[PDB]
Design goal:
By secondary structure, this protein is α+β, with helices and mostly antiparallel strands. The chain is 49% helix and 8% strand. The strands form four sheets. The chain has a four-stranded mixed β-sheet, with helices on one face. Strands 5-11-10 form a three-stranded antiparallel β-sheet. Bound molecules: protoporphyrin IX containing FE and ligand PXI. Pathway: Antibiotic biosynthesis.
Length: 393
């Protein structure tokens, strides 16, 4: 059992050599997370993509031998932690809200949010700012809160709970945040009842109240929860990891500046090169699964290392090169299979507008620290920075 916690911040800042060393030995490996959990790692692009869509690897915790606390189980009835037919039923309820054509209707508002955030950032007299606090945090939480009807005075506490899910000071802090967020979301759901709101949460409340078999009260809470959480840390870190990739590769930043039509491909390579999802969410084999002689027993926890899949040289030649013109087709930053990210059009819209605004409105935009001075969070599932100091003229 490889102890990942004994590797320190070096593994948090640069986990790729560790994953690559494992991939040379095999596709499946028993590890111990820095937090102390014994899980399986699936490495290698071909194996990673296959396991993500393999129905033998369930996402329902009824198939897991890991126990859930009361706070964890209260938020567990969501589409990401379900199999068919429950997953099919839950995703159908909101699939129309997140299509490309429906998300495109949010472009004027997303552009307005980015414009105002860049306005306040450019007001700095020294021309310096933390891109995390100035743009990477507020943009996604503002977009998803307006969509789901989360009032502004409640959004600050929502980020604190999210922070406790990724980098808790102690395991009890993560449990308290889950219990507090569940209590808040239930109160928020109750506040929509009978108010004739037209936000997404108001519509879900009416759907659940009209037919509890189509959306139970537990699944109503789980739906609000997963829609608000699954896209927060990921979108925040895509903007930050992507801008870090651009600013730490000046040749690519200048190429994008000279030809802004490469914007969409650059964002795709940001997902490929430094995607926010280091490893996919929990998967449990319903039966023993043989992966090239390595048998993963039923009920064990399996983490698909998307970060290693994106550095497999047979799939992405010269994998450690950040190339905004690279053929990025087939990356797993949004997953693969029935659980493929429902928010991918919205995430791409937010990232594309944010990156374009920073390049067009920050003359001589630059990383205000050395790459070695940046600090990465030690979470096996999320790849994200503590801060992104930047400067401009
Ligand atoms: C940078 C942006 C994003 C990235 C990299 C990302 C990544 C992912 C990945 C990898 C999965 C599948 C996880 C697995 O199979 O274990 C997923 C699923 C999901 N994502 Fe995202 N996501 C992003 C943005 C968003 C946003 C903004 C929302 C909210 C509207 C969202 C909502 C969801 C939901 C609800 C699922 C579960 C889908 C299902 O199980 O069918 N995501 N995402
Ligand atoms: C796009 C998927 C995001 O993943 C999540 O939202 C996962 C499911 C959630 O994972 C875990 O959160 C813990 C607080 C409890 C845990 N469970 C085992 C009791 C649950 O599965 C995130 C909230 C946690 C990670 C750190 C995260 O923020 C990642 C977000 C996306 C990858």
């Amino acid at each position: 059992v490889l102890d990942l916690g004994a590797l320190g911040q070096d593994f948090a800042a640069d986990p790729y050599p560790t994953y690559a060393r494992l991939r040379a030995e095999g596709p499946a490996h028993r590890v111990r997370t820095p937090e102390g959990d014994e899980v399986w790692l699936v490495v290698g692009y071909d194996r990673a993509r296959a396991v993500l869509a393999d129905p033998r690897f369930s996402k329902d915790w009824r198939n897991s031998t890991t126990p859930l606390t009361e706070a964890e189980a209260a938020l567990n009835h969501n589409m990401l932690e379900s199999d068919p037919p429950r997953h099919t039923r839950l995703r159908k309820l909101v699939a129309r809200e997140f299509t490309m054509r429906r998300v495109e209707l949010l472009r004027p508002r997303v552009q307005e949010i980015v414009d105002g955030l860049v306005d306040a950032m450019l007001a700095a007299p020294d021309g310096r700012a933390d891109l995390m606090e100035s743009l990477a945090w507020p943009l996604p939480i503002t977009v998803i809160s307006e969509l789901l009807g989360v009032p502004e005075p409640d959004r600050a506490a929502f980020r604190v709970w999210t922070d406790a899910f990724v980098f808790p000071d102690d395991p009890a802090q993560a449990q308290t945040a889950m219990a507090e967020m569940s209590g808040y979301l239930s109160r928020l759901i109750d506040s929509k009842r009978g108010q004739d709101g037209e936000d997404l949460l108001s519509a879900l409340v009416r759907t659940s109240d009209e037919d509890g078999s189509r959306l139970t009260s537990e699944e109503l809470l789980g739906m609000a929860f997963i829609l608000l959480v699954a896209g927060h840390e990921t979108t925040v870190n895509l903007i930050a990891n992507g801008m870090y990739a651009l600013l730490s590769h000046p040749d690519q930043l200048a190429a994008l500046r000279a030809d802004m039509t490469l914007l969409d491909g650059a964002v795709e390579e940001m997902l490929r090169y430094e995607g926010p999802v280091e490893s996919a969410t929990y998967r449990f084999p319903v039966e023993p699964v043989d992966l090239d002689g390595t048998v993963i027993p039923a009920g064990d926890t399996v983490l698909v290392v998307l970060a290693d899949a994106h550095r497999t040289p047979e799939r992405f030649p010269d994998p450690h090169r950040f190339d905004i013109r690279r053929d990025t087709a087939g990356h797993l930053a949004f997953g693969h299979g029935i659980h493929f990210c429902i928010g991918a059009p919205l995430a791409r819209l937010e990232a594309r507008i944010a990156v374009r605004a920073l390049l067009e409105r920050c003359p001589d935009l630059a990383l205000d620290v050395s790459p070695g001075e940046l600090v990465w969070y030690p979470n096996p599932m999320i790849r994200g920075l503590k801060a992104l100091p930047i400067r401009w003229r």
